[PDB]
Nucleic acid binder design. Structure first.
Ligand SMILES: [K+]
Ligand SMILES: [K+]
Ligand SMILES: [K+]
Ligand SMILES: [Mg+2]
Ligand SMILES: [Mg+2]
Length: 136
RNA sequence: ACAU
DNA sequence: CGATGT
């Protein structure tokens, strides 16, 4: 089982969990940063991993790219497959922004199609995903 | 247990 | 050491 180098890798970064959430997508081969989301003041790790995949799908579709996406998040891969982010984060005024983005990402999934394979990055075999923030 |  | 998730 080998890395598919012609791919997009995504990952969340956070300050606290729940805490400040950001995410980015990179070229798996070169590490070039292709997109980065502006920090969101409160969210969870899994909400951010979910948003990163959905943004990757939107990014690749806009560019007519058939590359797969790698994520290290078992949870977020499932949530994208299900088109449903099963987060436990409370809804209040401080979490309104992240929940709006997650709701809108689900809505996009329910109104668009894609063939993009969403693949598990095998951290145990390959080390940290290329989009990692280097914070652990 | 597994993945973050 | 704590949290988010299956
Ligand atoms: K990891
Ligand atoms: K990190
Ligand atoms: K646990
Ligand atoms: Mg990750
Ligand atoms: Mg990471």
């Amino acid at each position: 089982e080998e890395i598919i180098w012609e791919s997009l890798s995504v990952d969340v970064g956070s300050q606290g969990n729940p805490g400040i959430v950001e995410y980015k997508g990179v070229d798996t081969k070169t590490g070039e940063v292709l997109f980065e989301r502006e920090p969101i003041p409160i969210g969870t790790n899994n909400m951010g991993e979910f948003l990163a995949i959905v943004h990757g799908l939107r990014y690749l579709k806009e560019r007519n790219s058939r590359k797969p996406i790698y994520s290290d998040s078992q949870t977020a891969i499932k949530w994208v497959k299900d088109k449903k982010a099963k987060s436990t984060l409370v809804r209040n005024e401080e979490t309104a922004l992240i929940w709006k983005l997650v709701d809108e990402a689900e809505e996009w999934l329910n109104t668009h199609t894609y063939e993009t394979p969403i693949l598990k990055w095998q951290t145990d075999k390959w080390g940290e995903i290329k989009a990692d923030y280097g914070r652990k």
